[PDB]
Protein backbone atom coordinates (compact mmCIF):
# COMPACT_ATOMS: atom_id res chain seq x y z
CA UNK A 1 0.00 0.00 0.00
CA UNK A 2 1.27 4.00 -0.39
CA UNK A 3 -0.26 4.58 2.99
CA UNK A 4 0.51 3.09 6.50
CA UNK A 5 -1.96 4.32 8.70
CA UNK A 6 -2.48 4.66 12.59
CA UNK A 7 -5.53 2.55 14.26
CA UNK A 8 -8.25 3.22 11.63
CA UNK A 9 -11.09 3.17 14.28
CA UNK A 10 -10.47 5.96 17.32
CA UNK A 11 -12.51 6.40 20.38
CA UNK A 12 -12.24 10.29 21.70
CA UNK A 13 -14.41 11.62 25.00
CA UNK A 14 -14.96 15.36 24.37
CA UNK A 15 -11.75 17.36 24.95
CA UNK A 16 -9.19 15.15 24.53
CA UNK A 17 -6.07 15.00 22.50
CA UNK A 18 -6.23 12.90 19.58
CA UNK A 19 -3.19 12.20 17.41
CA UNK A 20 -3.30 10.39 14.13
CA UNK A 21 -0.94 9.16 11.61
CA UNK A 22 -0.05 8.42 7.63
CA UNK A 23 2.97 7.58 6.37
CA UNK A 24 3.89 7.74 2.83
CA UNK A 25 6.03 4.63 2.08
CA UNK A 26 8.93 5.11 -0.57
CA UNK A 27 9.35 8.76 -0.18
CA UNK A 28 11.43 11.04 -1.41
CA UNK A 29 12.46 14.94 -0.37
CA UNK A 30 9.54 16.20 -2.26
CA UNK A 31 6.87 13.79 -0.95
CA UNK A 32 3.76 15.43 0.44
CA UNK A 33 0.74 15.29 2.06
CA UNK A 34 -2.67 16.22 2.41
CA UNK A 35 -4.64 15.96 5.26
CA UNK A 36 -9.12 15.70 4.56
CA UNK A 37 -11.84 14.89 6.56
CA UNK A 38 -15.12 13.69 5.50
CA UNK A 39 -18.32 14.44 7.93
CA UNK A 40 -20.08 11.81 9.50
CA UNK A 41 -24.22 11.24 8.24
CA UNK A 42 -24.99 11.87 4.90
CA UNK A 43 -22.58 11.76 2.04
CA UNK A 44 -21.07 15.07 1.76
CA UNK A 45 -17.71 16.15 -0.11
CA UNK A 46 -14.64 16.16 1.92
CA UNK A 47 -12.57 19.07 3.67
CA UNK A 48 -9.34 20.67 3.24
CA UNK A 49 -7.68 20.66 6.52
CA UNK A 50 -3.93 21.15 5.16
CA UNK A 51 -0.97 20.41 2.73
CA UNK A 52 2.06 18.99 4.10
CA UNK A 53 5.93 19.26 3.14
CA UNK A 54 9.61 19.71 3.84
CA UNK A 55 9.35 23.28 1.90
CA UNK A 56 5.52 24.76 2.41
CA UNK A 57 2.72 24.21 4.99
CA UNK A 58 -0.85 24.87 4.34
CA UNK A 59 -3.58 25.09 6.23
CA UNK A 60 -7.03 25.77 5.25
CA UNK A 61 -8.66 29.10 5.31
CA UNK A 62 -10.80 29.29 8.44
CA UNK A 63 -9.06 26.28 9.91
CA UNK A 64 -8.61 26.74 14.28
CA UNK A 65 -5.21 25.83 14.21
CA UNK A 66 -5.75 25.60 17.90
CA UNK A 67 -7.81 22.80 17.95
CA UNK A 68 -6.78 20.90 14.48
CA UNK A 69 -2.71 21.42 13.41
CA UNK A 70 -0.45 19.11 11.47
CA UNK A 71 3.18 18.56 11.06
CA UNK A 72 5.39 16.18 8.84
CA UNK A 73 8.93 14.30 10.69
CA UNK A 74 10.49 12.71 8.19
CA UNK A 75 7.50 10.22 5.85
CA UNK A 76 5.62 10.28 8.73
CA UNK A 77 2.48 12.78 8.35
CA UNK A 78 0.60 13.54 11.56
CA UNK A 79 -2.91 15.28 12.84
CA UNK A 80 -2.86 16.36 16.30
CA UNK A 81 -6.94 17.13 17.23
CA UNK A 82 -6.02 19.09 20.75
CA UNK A 83 -9.44 19.28 22.40
CA UNK A 84 -11.70 17.09 20.84
CA UNK A 85 -15.01 18.91 19.74
CA UNK A 86 -18.24 17.31 19.50
CA UNK A 87 -17.93 18.46 15.79
CA UNK A 88 -14.67 16.64 15.30
CA UNK A 89 -16.47 13.42 15.07
CA UNK A 90 -15.71 11.85 11.41
CA UNK A 91 -13.35 10.55 8.86
CA UNK A 92 -9.81 11.40 8.55
CA UNK A 93 -7.56 10.32 5.51
CA UNK A 94 -4.39 11.53 3.74
CA UNK A 95 -4.50 12.26 0.03
CA UNK A 96 -0.74 12.34 -2.35
CA UNK A 97 -0.61 12.98 -5.77
CA UNK A 98 1.85 11.03 -8.28
CA UNK A 99 2.19 11.10 -11.90
CA UNK A 100 -2.06 12.61 -12.37
CA UNK A 101 -3.58 10.79 -9.86
CA UNK A 102 -4.58 11.45 -6.84
CA UNK A 103 -4.22 8.73 -3.71
CA UNK A 104 -6.47 8.41 -0.81
CA UNK A 105 -5.36 6.32 2.48
CA UNK A 106 -7.66 4.38 4.20
CA UNK A 107 -10.47 6.02 6.59
CA UNK A 108 -9.39 6.97 10.19
CA UNK A 109 -12.91 7.43 12.33
CA UNK A 110 -12.79 9.27 15.18
CA UNK A 111 -16.25 9.01 17.35
CA UNK A 112 -16.96 9.73 20.43
CA UNK A 113 -17.83 6.73 22.68
CA UNK A 114 -21.46 5.64 22.33
CA UNK B 1 -19.05 29.01 -6.12
CA UNK B 2 -15.76 27.71 -7.83
CA UNK B 3 -18.13 24.58 -8.99
CA UNK B 4 -20.96 24.53 -10.87
CA UNK B 5 -22.25 20.96 -11.08
CA UNK B 6 -25.55 19.08 -13.37
CA UNK B 7 -28.40 18.36 -11.07
CA UNK B 8 -26.92 17.05 -7.50
CA UNK B 9 -29.86 13.66 -7.61
CA UNK B 10 -30.07 11.58 -10.29
CA UNK B 11 -32.62 8.54 -10.74
CA UNK B 12 -30.83 6.11 -13.87
CA UNK B 13 -32.58 2.81 -15.16
CA UNK B 14 -30.00 -0.04 -15.71
CA UNK B 15 -28.25 0.27 -19.38
CA UNK B 16 -29.27 3.90 -19.34
CA UNK B 17 -26.39 6.56 -20.32
CA UNK B 18 -25.61 8.57 -17.68
CA UNK B 19 -23.96 11.96 -18.01
CA UNK B 20 -22.42 14.02 -15.02
CA UNK B 21 -20.64 17.80 -15.23
CA UNK B 22 -18.76 19.91 -13.14
CA UNK B 23 -17.58 23.31 -14.05
CA UNK B 24 -14.43 25.07 -12.88
CA UNK B 25 -16.15 28.52 -12.60
CA UNK B 26 -13.14 31.15 -11.89
CA UNK B 27 -10.78 29.92 -14.67
CA UNK B 28 -8.16 32.81 -14.69
CA UNK B 29 -6.01 30.14 -15.61
CA UNK B 30 -5.58 26.86 -17.47
CA UNK B 31 -8.27 24.36 -15.70
CA UNK B 32 -8.12 20.87 -14.94
CA UNK B 33 -10.59 18.27 -12.99
CA UNK B 34 -10.20 14.62 -11.34
CA UNK B 35 -12.88 12.77 -10.90
CA UNK B 36 -13.62 10.59 -8.15
CA UNK B 37 -16.19 8.42 -6.60
CA UNK B 38 -17.66 7.25 -3.11
CA UNK B 39 -19.31 3.97 -2.61
CA UNK B 40 -23.14 4.44 -1.29
CA UNK B 41 -23.30 1.93 1.72
CA UNK B 42 -20.35 2.06 4.26
CA UNK B 43 -18.17 5.12 4.54
CA UNK B 44 -14.98 4.27 2.97
CA UNK B 45 -11.69 6.57 0.98
CA UNK B 46 -12.85 8.14 -1.97
CA UNK B 47 -11.82 6.13 -5.52
CA UNK B 48 -9.56 8.10 -8.35
CA UNK B 49 -11.62 7.50 -11.80
CA UNK B 50 -9.66 9.57 -14.09
CA UNK B 51 -7.93 13.38 -13.94
CA UNK B 52 -8.61 15.29 -16.87
CA UNK B 53 -6.64 18.00 -18.38
CA UNK B 54 -5.69 19.75 -21.80
CA UNK B 55 -1.95 18.42 -21.98
CA UNK B 56 -2.73 15.17 -20.20
CA UNK B 57 -5.83 12.68 -19.25
CA UNK B 58 -5.06 9.76 -17.48
CA UNK B 59 -7.35 6.51 -16.61
CA UNK B 60 -7.32 5.04 -12.98
CA UNK B 61 -5.83 1.66 -13.30
CA UNK B 62 -8.58 -1.03 -13.56
CA UNK B 63 -10.98 1.28 -14.95
CA UNK B 64 -13.29 -0.34 -17.68
CA UNK B 65 -13.17 2.53 -20.38
CA UNK B 66 -16.52 0.87 -22.16
CA UNK B 67 -18.45 1.57 -18.65
CA UNK B 68 -17.17 4.54 -17.61
CA UNK B 69 -15.16 7.67 -19.57
CA UNK B 70 -15.14 11.12 -19.28
CA UNK B 71 -13.62 14.38 -21.33
CA UNK B 72 -12.99 18.25 -20.65
CA UNK B 73 -14.08 20.84 -22.97
CA UNK B 74 -13.28 24.49 -22.13
CA UNK B 75 -13.79 24.95 -17.89
CA UNK B 76 -16.79 21.93 -18.24
CA UNK B 77 -16.05 18.80 -17.59
CA UNK B 78 -17.84 15.60 -17.84
CA UNK B 79 -17.95 11.98 -16.83
CA UNK B 80 -20.24 9.22 -18.66
CA UNK B 81 -21.47 6.25 -17.52
CA UNK B 82 -22.24 4.54 -20.87
CA UNK B 83 -24.35 1.40 -19.71
CA UNK B 84 -25.37 2.39 -16.17
CA UNK B 85 -25.11 -0.46 -13.33
CA UNK B 86 -26.15 -1.79 -10.15
CA UNK B 87 -22.54 -1.04 -9.38
CA UNK B 88 -22.47 2.18 -10.88
CA UNK B 89 -24.59 3.56 -8.12
CA UNK B 90 -22.97 6.16 -5.46
CA UNK B 91 -21.57 9.19 -5.18
CA UNK B 92 -19.43 11.63 -8.05
CA UNK B 93 -17.71 14.61 -7.44
CA UNK B 94 -14.68 16.50 -8.82
CA UNK B 95 -11.42 17.62 -7.56
CA UNK B 96 -9.13 20.37 -8.32
CA UNK B 97 -6.00 21.29 -7.15
CA UNK B 98 -4.47 25.10 -7.09
CA UNK B 99 -1.55 26.71 -5.20
CA UNK B 100 -1.18 23.84 -2.92
CA UNK B 101 -5.15 23.55 -1.50
CA UNK B 102 -7.77 21.05 -2.76
CA UNK B 103 -10.93 22.08 -3.85
CA UNK B 104 -13.69 19.61 -4.54
CA UNK B 105 -17.22 20.27 -5.80
CA UNK B 106 -20.68 19.00 -4.68
CA UNK B 107 -21.69 15.58 -4.64
CA UNK B 108 -24.03 14.02 -7.31
CA UNK B 109 -25.88 11.25 -6.65
CA UNK B 110 -27.06 8.83 -9.14
CA UNK B 111 -29.26 5.86 -8.08
CA UNK B 112 -31.25 3.43 -9.50
CA UNK B 113 -35.45 3.73 -8.74
CA UNK B 114 -36.44 2.42 -4.78
Not at 28 to 48: D, E, M, V
Not at 77 to 93: A, T
Request: proline letters at 4%.
Amino acid sequence: SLFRTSPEMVQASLGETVKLRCEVMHSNTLTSCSWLYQKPGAASKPIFLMYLSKTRNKTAEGLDTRYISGYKANDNFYLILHRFREEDQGYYFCSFLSNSVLYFSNFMSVFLPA
